[PDB]
GROMACS .gro file of C-alpha atoms in nm:
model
  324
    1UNK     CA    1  11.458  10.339   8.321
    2UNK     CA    2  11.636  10.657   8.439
    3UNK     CA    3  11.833  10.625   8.705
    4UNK     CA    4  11.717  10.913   8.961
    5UNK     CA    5  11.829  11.070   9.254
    6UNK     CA    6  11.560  11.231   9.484
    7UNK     CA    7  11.591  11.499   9.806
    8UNK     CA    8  11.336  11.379  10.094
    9UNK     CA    9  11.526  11.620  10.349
   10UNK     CA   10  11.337  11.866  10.545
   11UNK     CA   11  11.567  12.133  10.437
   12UNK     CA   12  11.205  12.353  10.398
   13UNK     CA   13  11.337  12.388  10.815
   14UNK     CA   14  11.685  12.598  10.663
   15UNK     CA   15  11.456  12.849  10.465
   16UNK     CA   16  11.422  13.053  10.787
   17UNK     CA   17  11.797  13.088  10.758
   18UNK     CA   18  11.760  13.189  10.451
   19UNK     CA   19  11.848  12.871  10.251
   20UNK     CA   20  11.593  12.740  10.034
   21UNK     CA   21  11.846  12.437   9.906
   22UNK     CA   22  11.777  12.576   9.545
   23UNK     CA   23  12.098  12.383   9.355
   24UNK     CA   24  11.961  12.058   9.466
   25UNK     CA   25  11.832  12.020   9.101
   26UNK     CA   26  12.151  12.197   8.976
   27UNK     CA   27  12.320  11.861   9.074
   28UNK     CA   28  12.005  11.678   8.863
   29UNK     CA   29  11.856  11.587   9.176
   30UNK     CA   30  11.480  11.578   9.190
   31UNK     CA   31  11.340  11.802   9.457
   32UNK     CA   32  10.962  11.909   9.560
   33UNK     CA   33  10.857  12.249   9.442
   34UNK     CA   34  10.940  12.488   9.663
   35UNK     CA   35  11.117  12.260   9.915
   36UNK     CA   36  10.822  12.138  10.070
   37UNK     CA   37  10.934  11.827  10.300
   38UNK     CA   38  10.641  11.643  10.167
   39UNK     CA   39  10.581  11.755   9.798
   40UNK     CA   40  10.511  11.705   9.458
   41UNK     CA   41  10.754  11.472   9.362
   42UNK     CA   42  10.802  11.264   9.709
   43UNK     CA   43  10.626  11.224  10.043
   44UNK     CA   44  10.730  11.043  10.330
   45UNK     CA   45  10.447  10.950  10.609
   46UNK     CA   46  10.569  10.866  10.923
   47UNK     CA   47  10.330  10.634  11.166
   48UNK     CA   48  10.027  10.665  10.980
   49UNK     CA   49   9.670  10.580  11.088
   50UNK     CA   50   9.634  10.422  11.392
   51UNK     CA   51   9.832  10.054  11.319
   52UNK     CA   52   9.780   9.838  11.620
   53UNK     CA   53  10.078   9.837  11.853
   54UNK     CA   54  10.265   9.856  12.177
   55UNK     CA   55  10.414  10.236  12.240
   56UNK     CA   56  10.683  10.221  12.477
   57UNK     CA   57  10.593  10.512  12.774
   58UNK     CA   58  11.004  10.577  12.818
   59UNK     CA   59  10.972  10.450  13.141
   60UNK     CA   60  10.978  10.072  13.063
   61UNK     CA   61  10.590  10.049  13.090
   62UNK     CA   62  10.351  10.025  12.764
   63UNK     CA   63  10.037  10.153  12.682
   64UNK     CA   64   9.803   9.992  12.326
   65UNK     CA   65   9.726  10.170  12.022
   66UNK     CA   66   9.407  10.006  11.869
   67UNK     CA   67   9.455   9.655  11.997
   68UNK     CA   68   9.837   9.646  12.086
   69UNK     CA   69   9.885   9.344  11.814
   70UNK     CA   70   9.666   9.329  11.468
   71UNK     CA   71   9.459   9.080  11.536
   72UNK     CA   72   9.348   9.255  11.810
   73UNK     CA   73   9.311   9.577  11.628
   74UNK     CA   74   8.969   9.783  11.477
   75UNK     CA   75   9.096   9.830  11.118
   76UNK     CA   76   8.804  10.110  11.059
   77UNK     CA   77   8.959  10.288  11.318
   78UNK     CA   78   9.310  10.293  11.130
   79UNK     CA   79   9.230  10.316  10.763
   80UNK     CA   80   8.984  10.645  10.906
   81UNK     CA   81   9.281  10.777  11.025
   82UNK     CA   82   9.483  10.708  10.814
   83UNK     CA   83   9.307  10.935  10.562
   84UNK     CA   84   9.286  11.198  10.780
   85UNK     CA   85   9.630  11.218  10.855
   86UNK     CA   86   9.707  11.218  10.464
   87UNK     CA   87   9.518  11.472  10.380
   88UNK     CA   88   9.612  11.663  10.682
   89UNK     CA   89  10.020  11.601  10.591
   90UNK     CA   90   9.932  11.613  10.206
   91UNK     CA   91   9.568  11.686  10.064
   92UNK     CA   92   9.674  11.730   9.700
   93UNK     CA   93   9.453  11.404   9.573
   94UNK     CA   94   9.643  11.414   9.227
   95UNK     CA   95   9.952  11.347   9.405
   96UNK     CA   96  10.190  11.172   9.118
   97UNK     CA   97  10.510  11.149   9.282
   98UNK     CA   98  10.636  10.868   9.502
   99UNK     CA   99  10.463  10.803   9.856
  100UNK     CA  100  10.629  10.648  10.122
  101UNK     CA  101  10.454  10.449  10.397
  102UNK     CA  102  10.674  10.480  10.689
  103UNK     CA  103  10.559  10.195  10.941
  104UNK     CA  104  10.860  10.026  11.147
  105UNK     CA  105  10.643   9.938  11.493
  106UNK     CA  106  10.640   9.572  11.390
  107UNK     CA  107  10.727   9.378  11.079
  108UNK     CA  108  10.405   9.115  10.883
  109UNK     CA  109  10.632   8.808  10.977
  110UNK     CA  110  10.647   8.695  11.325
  111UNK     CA  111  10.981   8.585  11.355
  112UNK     CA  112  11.130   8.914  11.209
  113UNK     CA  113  11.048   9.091  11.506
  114UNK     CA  114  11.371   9.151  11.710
  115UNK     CA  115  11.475   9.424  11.961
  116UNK     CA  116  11.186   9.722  12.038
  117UNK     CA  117  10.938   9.518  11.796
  118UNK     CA  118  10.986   9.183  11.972
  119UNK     CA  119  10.691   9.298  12.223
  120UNK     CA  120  10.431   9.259  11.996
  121UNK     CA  121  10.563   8.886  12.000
  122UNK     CA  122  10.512   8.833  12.369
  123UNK     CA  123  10.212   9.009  12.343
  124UNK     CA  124  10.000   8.803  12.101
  125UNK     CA  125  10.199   8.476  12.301
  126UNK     CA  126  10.023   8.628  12.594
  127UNK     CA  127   9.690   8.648  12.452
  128UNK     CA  128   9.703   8.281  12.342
  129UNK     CA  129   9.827   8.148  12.675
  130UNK     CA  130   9.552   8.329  12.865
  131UNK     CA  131   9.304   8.177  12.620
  132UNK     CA  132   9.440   7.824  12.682
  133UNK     CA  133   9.608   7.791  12.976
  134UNK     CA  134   9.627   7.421  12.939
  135UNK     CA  135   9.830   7.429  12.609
  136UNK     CA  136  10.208   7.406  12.535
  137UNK     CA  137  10.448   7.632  12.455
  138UNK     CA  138  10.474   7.488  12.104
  139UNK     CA  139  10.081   7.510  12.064
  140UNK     CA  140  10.020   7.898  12.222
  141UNK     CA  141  10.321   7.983  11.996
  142UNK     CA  142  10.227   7.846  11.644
  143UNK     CA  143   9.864   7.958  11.709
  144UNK     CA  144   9.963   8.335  11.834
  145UNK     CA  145  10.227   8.326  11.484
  146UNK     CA  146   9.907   8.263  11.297
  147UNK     CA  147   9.700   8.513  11.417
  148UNK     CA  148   9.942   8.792  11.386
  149UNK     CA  149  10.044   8.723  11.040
  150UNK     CA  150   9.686   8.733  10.915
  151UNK     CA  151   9.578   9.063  11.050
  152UNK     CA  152   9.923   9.208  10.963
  153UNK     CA  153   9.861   9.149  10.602
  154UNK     CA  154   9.518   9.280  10.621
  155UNK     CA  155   9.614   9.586  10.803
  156UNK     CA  156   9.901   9.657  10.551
  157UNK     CA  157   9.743   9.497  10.246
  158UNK     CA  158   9.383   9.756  10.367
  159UNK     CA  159   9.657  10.051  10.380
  160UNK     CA  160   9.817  10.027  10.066
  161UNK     CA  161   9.497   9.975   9.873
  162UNK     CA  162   9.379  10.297  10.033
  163UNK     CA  163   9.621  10.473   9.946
  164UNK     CA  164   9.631  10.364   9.600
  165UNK     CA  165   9.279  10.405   9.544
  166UNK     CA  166   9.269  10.841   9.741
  167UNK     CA  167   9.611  10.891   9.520
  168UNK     CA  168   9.560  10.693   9.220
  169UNK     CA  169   9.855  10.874   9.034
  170UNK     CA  170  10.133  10.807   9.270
  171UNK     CA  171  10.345  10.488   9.326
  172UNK     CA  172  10.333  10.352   9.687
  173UNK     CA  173  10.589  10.138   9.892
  174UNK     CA  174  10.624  10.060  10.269
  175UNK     CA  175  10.994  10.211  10.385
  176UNK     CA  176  11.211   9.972  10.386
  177UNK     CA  177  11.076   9.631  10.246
  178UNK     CA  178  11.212   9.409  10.114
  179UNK     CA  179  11.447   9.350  10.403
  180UNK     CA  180  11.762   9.164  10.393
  181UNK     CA  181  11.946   9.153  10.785
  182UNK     CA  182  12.315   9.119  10.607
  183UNK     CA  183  12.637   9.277  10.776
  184UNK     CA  184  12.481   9.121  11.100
  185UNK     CA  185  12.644   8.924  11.454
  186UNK     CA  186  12.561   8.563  11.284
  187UNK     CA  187  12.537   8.733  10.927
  188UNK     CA  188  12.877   8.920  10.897
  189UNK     CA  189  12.859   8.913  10.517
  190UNK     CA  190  12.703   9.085  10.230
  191UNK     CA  191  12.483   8.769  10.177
  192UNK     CA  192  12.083   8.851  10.308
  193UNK     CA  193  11.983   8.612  10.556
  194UNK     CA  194  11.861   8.303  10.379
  195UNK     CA  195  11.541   8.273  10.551
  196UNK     CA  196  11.463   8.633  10.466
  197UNK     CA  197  11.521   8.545  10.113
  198UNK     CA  198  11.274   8.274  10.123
  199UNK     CA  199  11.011   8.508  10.369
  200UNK     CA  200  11.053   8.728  10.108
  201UNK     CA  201  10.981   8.484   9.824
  202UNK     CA  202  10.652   8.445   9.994
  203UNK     CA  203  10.594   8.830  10.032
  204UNK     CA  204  10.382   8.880   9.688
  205UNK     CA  205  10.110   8.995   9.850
  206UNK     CA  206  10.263   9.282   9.957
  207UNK     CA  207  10.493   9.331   9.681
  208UNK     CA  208  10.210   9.302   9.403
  209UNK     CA  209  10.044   9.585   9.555
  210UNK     CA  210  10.328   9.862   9.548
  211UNK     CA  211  10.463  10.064   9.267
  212UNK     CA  212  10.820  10.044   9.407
  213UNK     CA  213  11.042   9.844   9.648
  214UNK     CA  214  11.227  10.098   9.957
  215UNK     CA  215  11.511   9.915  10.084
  216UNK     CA  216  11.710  10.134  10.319
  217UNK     CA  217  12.113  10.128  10.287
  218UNK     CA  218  12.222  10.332  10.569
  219UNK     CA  219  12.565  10.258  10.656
  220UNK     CA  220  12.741  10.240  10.992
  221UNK     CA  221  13.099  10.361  11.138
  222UNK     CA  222  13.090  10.052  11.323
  223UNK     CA  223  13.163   9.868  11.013
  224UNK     CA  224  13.493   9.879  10.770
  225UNK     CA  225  13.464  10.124  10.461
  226UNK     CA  226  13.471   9.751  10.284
  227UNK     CA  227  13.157   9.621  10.494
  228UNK     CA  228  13.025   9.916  10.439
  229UNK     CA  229  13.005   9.871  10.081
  230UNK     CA  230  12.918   9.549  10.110
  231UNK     CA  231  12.607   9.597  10.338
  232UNK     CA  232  12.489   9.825  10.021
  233UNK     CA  233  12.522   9.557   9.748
  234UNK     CA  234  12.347   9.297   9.907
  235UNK     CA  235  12.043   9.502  10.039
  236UNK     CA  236  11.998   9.656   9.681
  237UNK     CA  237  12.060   9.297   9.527
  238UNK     CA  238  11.783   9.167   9.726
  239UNK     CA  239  11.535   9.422   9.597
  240UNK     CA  240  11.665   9.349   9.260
  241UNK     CA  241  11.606   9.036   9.305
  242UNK     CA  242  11.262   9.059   9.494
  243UNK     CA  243  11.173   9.316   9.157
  244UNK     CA  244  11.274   9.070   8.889
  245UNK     CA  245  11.060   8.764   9.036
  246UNK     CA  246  10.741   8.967   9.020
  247UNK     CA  247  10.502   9.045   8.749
  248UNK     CA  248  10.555   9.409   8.684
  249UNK     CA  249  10.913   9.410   8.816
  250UNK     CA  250  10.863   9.762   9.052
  251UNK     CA  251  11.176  10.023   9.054
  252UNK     CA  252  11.397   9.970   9.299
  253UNK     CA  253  11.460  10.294   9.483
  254UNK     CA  254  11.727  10.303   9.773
  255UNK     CA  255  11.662  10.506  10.086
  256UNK     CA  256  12.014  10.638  10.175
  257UNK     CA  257  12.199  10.893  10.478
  258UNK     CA  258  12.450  11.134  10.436
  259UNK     CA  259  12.544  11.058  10.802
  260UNK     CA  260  12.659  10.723  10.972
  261UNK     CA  261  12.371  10.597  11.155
  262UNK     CA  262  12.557  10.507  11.496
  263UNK     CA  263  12.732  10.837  11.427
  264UNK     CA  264  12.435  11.096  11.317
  265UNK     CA  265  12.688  11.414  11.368
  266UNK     CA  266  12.954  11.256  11.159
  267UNK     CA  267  12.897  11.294  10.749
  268UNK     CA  268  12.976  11.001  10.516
  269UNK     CA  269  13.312  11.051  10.416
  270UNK     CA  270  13.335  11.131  10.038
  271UNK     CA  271  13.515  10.763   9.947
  272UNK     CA  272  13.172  10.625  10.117
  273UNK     CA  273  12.919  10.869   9.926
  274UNK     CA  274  13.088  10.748   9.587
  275UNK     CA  275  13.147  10.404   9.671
  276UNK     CA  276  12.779  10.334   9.797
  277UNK     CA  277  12.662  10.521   9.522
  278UNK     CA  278  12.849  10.332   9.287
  279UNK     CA  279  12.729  10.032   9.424
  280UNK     CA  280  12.337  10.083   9.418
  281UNK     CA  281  12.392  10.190   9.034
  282UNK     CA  282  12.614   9.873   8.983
  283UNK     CA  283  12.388   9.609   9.140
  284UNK     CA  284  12.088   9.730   8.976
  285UNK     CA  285  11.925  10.011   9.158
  286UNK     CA  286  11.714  10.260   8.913
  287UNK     CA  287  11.755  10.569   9.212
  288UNK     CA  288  11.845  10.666   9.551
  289UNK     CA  289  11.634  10.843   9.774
  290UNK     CA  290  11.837  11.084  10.031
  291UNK     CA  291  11.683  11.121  10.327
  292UNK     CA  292  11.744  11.337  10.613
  293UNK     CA  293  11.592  11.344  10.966
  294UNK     CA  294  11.494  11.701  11.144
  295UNK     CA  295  11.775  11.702  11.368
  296UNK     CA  296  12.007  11.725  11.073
  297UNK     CA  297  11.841  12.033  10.972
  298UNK     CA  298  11.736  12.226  11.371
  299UNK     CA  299  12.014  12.450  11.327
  300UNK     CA  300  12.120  12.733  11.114
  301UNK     CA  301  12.555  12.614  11.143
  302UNK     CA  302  12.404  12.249  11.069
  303UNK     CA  303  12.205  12.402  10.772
  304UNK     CA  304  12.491  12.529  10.609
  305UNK     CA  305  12.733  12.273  10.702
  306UNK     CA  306  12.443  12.044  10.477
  307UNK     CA  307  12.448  12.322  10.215
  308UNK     CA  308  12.854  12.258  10.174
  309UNK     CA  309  12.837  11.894  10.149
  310UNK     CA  310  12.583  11.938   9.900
  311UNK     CA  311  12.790  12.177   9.704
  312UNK     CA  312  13.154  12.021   9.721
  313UNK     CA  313  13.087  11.617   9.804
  314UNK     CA  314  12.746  11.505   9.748
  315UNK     CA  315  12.578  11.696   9.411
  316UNK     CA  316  12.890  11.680   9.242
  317UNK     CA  317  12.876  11.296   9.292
  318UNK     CA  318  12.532  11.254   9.251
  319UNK     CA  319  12.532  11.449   8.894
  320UNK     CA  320  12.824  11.236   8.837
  321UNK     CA  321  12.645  10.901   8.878
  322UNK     CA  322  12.332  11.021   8.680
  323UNK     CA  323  12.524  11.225   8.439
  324UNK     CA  324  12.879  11.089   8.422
   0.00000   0.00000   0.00000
């Protein structure tokens, strides 16, 4: 199909400055009517409903939303919500433009649950253990693994069926899926983590039910402008990849930053806009979605600084790529 380029920046936050962003589509890039952060042509939900987790307080304590783990969680509860907030965020039921279910709390396989997710691991290990105190570690492990997986499925299968069925003209994904882990400490390469690859063989069920794959390419200043590049190509490779194996073979749009992510103040530098660019197009992407966060945008000098990158590094390339 066409390869597109979408704006999900809350730049609607700059019109009190006086700068509506109104030559985003002068660079062919698609943006909502009127600027609206979550519009007519994409919409971005953050958190949801009510999925069961573990919030962190700040203070190294926890407190549990609906269950702390899935299979601990009321799913009424969350799909109820879950509506609300949508309608809420974005009533407009004939909706046709691309929604984005942004859930990162915890991810539907066990073991990909590292760093501020790995709670919900210990958790639902917890739960089993207090239920059989007389089991191994091997045992309480495998069983709480079991449990989890199930009622994460159901609780994002449930979701994405809802939202399919209240918005039956727009074409859902989950931010982010499928994952890949590449540029990593024991993964230094472009190459997705084998074991994903295979987790995400298994991942039709989840797949199946979208109307486009959301892998997210943000780039670091950590890395080499070369590893850099490379973390793009493999990421949109595996969503390619993922797409081509499955029946109806869903776009493959590319969540991307104009800012390093270890370096939010500091703008990709223009060799890094074209080469990742260049590199989602060249692997097989069919768009790139460029999103922005609202601390790139709380400011009128940071407003403006965005409107110049947009003018003299970014549209120019991004008409380029779609229009070259």
């Amino acid at each position: 199909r066409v390869f597109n380029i979408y704006w999900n920046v809350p730049t609607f936050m700059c019109h009190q400055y006086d700068l509506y962003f109104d030559e985003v589509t002068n660079f062919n890039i698609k943006r909502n009517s009127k600027d609206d952060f979550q519009g007519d042509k994409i919409a971005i939900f953050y958190d949801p409903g009510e999925f069961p987790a573990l919030l962190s307080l700040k203070d190294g304590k926890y407190k549990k939303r609906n269950g702390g783990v899935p299979q601990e969680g009321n799913i009424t509860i969350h799909l109820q919500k879950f509506i609300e907030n949508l309608d809420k965020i974005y009533p407009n039921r004939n909706f046709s433009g691309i929604g984005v279910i942004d859930f990162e709390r915890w991810r539907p396989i066990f073991r990909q649950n590292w760093g501020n997710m790995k709670i919900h691991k210990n958790f639902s290990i917890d739960l089993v253990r207090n239920e059989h105190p007389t089991w191994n570690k091997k045992m309480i492990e495998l069983e709480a693994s079991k449990r989890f997986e199930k009622y994460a499925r159901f609780f994002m299968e449930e979701t994405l069926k809802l939202a399919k069925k209240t918005r039956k003209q727009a074409d859902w994904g989950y931010y982010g899926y499928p994952y890949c882990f590449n540029m990593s400490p024991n993964n230094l390469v472009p190459e997705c983590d084998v074991t994903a690859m295979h987790e995400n063989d298994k991942m039709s069920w989840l797949f199946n039910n979208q109307n486009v794959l959301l892998p997210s390419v943000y780039v670091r200043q950590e890395l080499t402008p070369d590893q850099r590049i490379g973390l793009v190509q493999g990421r949109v490779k595996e969503a390619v990849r993922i797409s081509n194996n499955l029946k109806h073979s869903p776009k493959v749009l590319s969540y991307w930053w104009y800012v390093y992510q270890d370096e939010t103040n500091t703008f990709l530098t223009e060799t890094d806009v074209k080469k990742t660019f260049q590199e989602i197009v060249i692997n097989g992407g069919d768009g790139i979605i460029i999103w922005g966060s609202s601390s790139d945008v709380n400011s009128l000098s940071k407003c403006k600084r965005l409107q110049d990158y947009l003018l003299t590094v970014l549209g120019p390339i991004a008409i380029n790529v779609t229009e070259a």
